RNA sequence: CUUC
């Protein structure tokens, strides 16, 4: 729930619509960050596409770092 | 709901 970073840019590595999650690779540190469908801002509402550039916050989830408030750049 |  704690915000670790804000307005981070990254590239969607993959996002699986069957399982409802994927990973975004941060452009600043080159680390993958977990992203759940519920963390994506508005059929497949709340999805992102592989290869897309997104902007997001990084928070500390139960299981480590995850994306929050995932939107288009800007 | 953590590398499909």
UniProtKB/Swiss-Prot annotation:
Residue numbers carrying Phosphoserine: 47
Annotated site location: Important for C5-methylcytosine-recognition: 14
Transmembrane annotation, as ranges: none
Domain CSD: 10-70
Compartmental location: Cytoplasm; Nucleus; Cytoplasmic granule; Secreted
Region (C5-methylcytosine binding): 14-19
PTM description: Ubiquitinated by RBBP6; leading to a decrease of YBX1 transactivational ability. Phosphorylated; increased by TGFB1 treatment. Phosphorylation by PKB/AKT1 reduces interaction with cytoplasmic mRNA. In the absence of phosphorylation the protein is retained in the cytoplasm.
Self-association and partners: Homodimer in the presence of ATP. Component of the coding region determinant (CRD)-mediated complex, composed of DHX9, HNRNPU, IGF2BP1, SYNCRIP and YBX1. Identified in a IGF2BP1-dependent mRNP granule complex containing untranslated mRNAs. Component of the U11/U12 snRNPs that are part of the U12-type spliceosome. Identified in a histone pre-mRNA complex, at least composed of ERI1, LSM11, SLBP, SNRPB, SYNCRIP and YBX1. Interacts with IGF2BP1 and RBBP6. Component of cytoplasmic messenger ribonucleoprotein particles (mRNPs).
Note on domains (UniProt): In the CSD domain, Trp-14 specifically recognizes C5-methylcytosine (m5C) modification through its indole ring.
Function, in words: DNA- and RNA-binding protein involved in various processes, such as translational repression, RNA stabilization, mRNA splicing, DNA repair and transcription regulation. Predominantly acts as a RNA-binding protein: binds preferentially to the 5'-[CU]CUGCG-3' RNA motif and specifically recognizes mRNA transcripts modified by C5-methylcytosine (m5C). Promotes mRNA stabilization: acts by binding to m5C-containing mRNAs and recruiting the mRNA stability maintainer ELAVL1, thereby preventing mRNA decay. Component of the CRD-mediated complex that promotes MYC mRNA stability.
Name recorded for this polypeptide: Y-box-binding protein 1
Source organism per UniProt: Homo sapiens (Human)
Entire-sequence positions represented here: 52 to 129 of 324
């Amino acid at each position: 729930k704690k915000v670790i970073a804000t307005k981070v840019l990254g590239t969607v590595k993959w996002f699986n619509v069957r399982n409802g999650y994927g990973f975004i690779n941060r452009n600043d540190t080159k680390e993958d960050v977990f992203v759940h469908q519920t963390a994506i801002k508005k059929k497949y509402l709340r999805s992102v596409g592989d290869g897309e550039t997104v902007e997001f916050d990084v928070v500390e989830g139960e299981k480590g770092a995850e994306a929050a408030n995932v939107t288009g750049p800007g």
